[PDB]
Amino acid sequence: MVDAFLGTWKLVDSKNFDDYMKSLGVGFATRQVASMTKPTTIIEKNGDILTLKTHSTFKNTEISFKLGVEFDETTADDRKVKSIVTLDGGKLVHLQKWDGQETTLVRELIDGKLILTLTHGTAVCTRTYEKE
């Protein structure tokens, strides 16, 4: 199940992140900085509680959750959302809902790399992380 996702990951490729942020309404100055930032994502577990940290020189976030149990979240761009994370087809699928809108954050493992696919509206972004 989740164990192969655990650890420290560093961003090594990003496609269409500006399009995704624009779709969400993120302002230009935040997008400019975020486009050059290379976050570290740390995924830890304690029993069935997962913690996902995203660290950078700009934004820092942390969420803790049980798989399959909804939780409140405030995103890096300050959306207040209702979230759930689950394991679907071997992928870690994070769904965020607010104001009747949705976005998905899907994490898969491919050849040892962590591929994060972000979808909102028509915008589809792919970020690739490598394990530290």
- Annotated binding site: which residue ranges? 127-129
Q: Does 24 bind ligand J3R (CB under 6 A)?
A: yes
Binding-site residues for (9Z)-octadecenoate, please? 127-129
Name residues contacting ligand J3R, limited to 45-64 (CB under 6 A). 54, 59
- Tell me if 26 contacts ligand J3R by CB under 6 A: yes
Strand order in the sheet with 61-66: 61-66, 49-55, 40-46, 7-15, 123-131, 113-120, 101-110, 91-98, 80-88, 71-74
Terminal C-alpha separation, the chain: 20
Candidate list 5, 9, 21, 85; residue touching ligand J3R; CB under 6 A: 21
47 vs 128 by CB, closer to ligand J3R = 128
